[PDB]
Ligand binder design. Structure first.
Ligand SMILES: *[C@@H]1O[C@H](CO)[C@@H](O[C@@H]2O[C@H](CO)[C@@H](O)[C@H](O)[C@H]2NC(C)=O)[C@H](O)[C@H]1NC(C)=O
Lengths: 198, 39
């Protein structure tokens, strides 16, 4: 009966920073994925299982919607098998991902004259993230031979950096809002069904 | 070791930000990432 509240995700006023990406569980509702696909101008809308139209005949236990902001030239890392600053240290998709990755330019909401400092990314980490792992820690990172003891200094860095988005950036360095839809199929009665299911 | 040059590149990244060179700072950040991946 209920229509799935994709609007609460895609139309949120503020998005999460990628290092602390947000996840919303979508359950117990009817989802029209073709209407979502057509709901706005997207720069990326790449599904790794089936297409939106084909999604509309499918039912899932839950749908997860992960959202955050990155640079336009980083959206390519939100994909199975990719490496880079974002895929390694911030948000990692599994090699067997079969959901959808959706993105759009948000220069008009997430940039500021003089630099927006609300959005940050992790620049340093001792190891790469596991798929769907989330690291919100802020331990001073030991880049050199000597321990940091919790104090910033020589080769001892705060692990997050601000994007500093300014509207005059080149488009590859402009902010993009990203939504990743994961389609969960447990051994369970479905709770999220497409518009043309059954 | 890379300790001195890593620190200098880190410091330029931070200075470029404070001076509003927000996009130049991101280019330096990318280099820090690639540099630190190397042995
Ligand atoms: C995000 O917000 C926009 C703006 O309200 C929604 O677009 C409207 O959708 C309704 C129903 O489909 C239409 O009747 C309006 O004409 C749309 N307005 C515009 C300006 O396109 C959009 O549906 C929302 N996104 C999601 C995923 O819910």
């Amino acid at each position: 009966t209920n229509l799935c509240p994709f609007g609460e995700v895609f139309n949120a006023t503020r998005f999460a920073s990628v290092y602390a990406w947000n996840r919303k569980r979508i359950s117990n509702c009817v989802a029209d994925y073709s209407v979502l696909y057509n709901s706005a101008s997207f720069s990326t809308f790449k599904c790794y299982g089936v297409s939106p139209t084909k999604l509309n005949d499918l039912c899932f236990t839950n749908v997860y919607a992960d959202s955050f902001v990155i640079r336009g030239d980083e959206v390519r890392q939100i994909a199975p098998g990719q490496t880079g600053k974002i895929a390694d240290y911030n948000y990692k998709l599994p090699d067997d991902f079969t959901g959808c990755v959706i993105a759009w330019n948000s220069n008009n909401l997430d940039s500021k004259v003089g630099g927006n400092y609300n959005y940050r990314y992790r620049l340093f980490r001792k190891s790469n993230l596991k798929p769907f792992e989330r690291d919100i820690s802020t331990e001073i990172y030991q880049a050199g031979s000597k321990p940091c003891n919790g104090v910033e200094g020589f080769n001892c860095y705060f692990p997050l950096q601000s994007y500093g988005f300014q509207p005059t950036n080149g488009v590859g360095y402009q902010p993009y809002r990203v939504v990743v839809l994961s389609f969960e199929l447990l051994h369970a009665p479905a709770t999220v069904c497409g518009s043309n299911s059954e | 070791d890379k300790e001195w040059i890593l620190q200098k590149i880190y410091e330029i990244m931070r200075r470029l930000d404070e001076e509003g060179h927000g996009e130049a700072s991101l280019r330096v950040s990318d280099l820090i990432y690639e540099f630190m991946k190397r042995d």
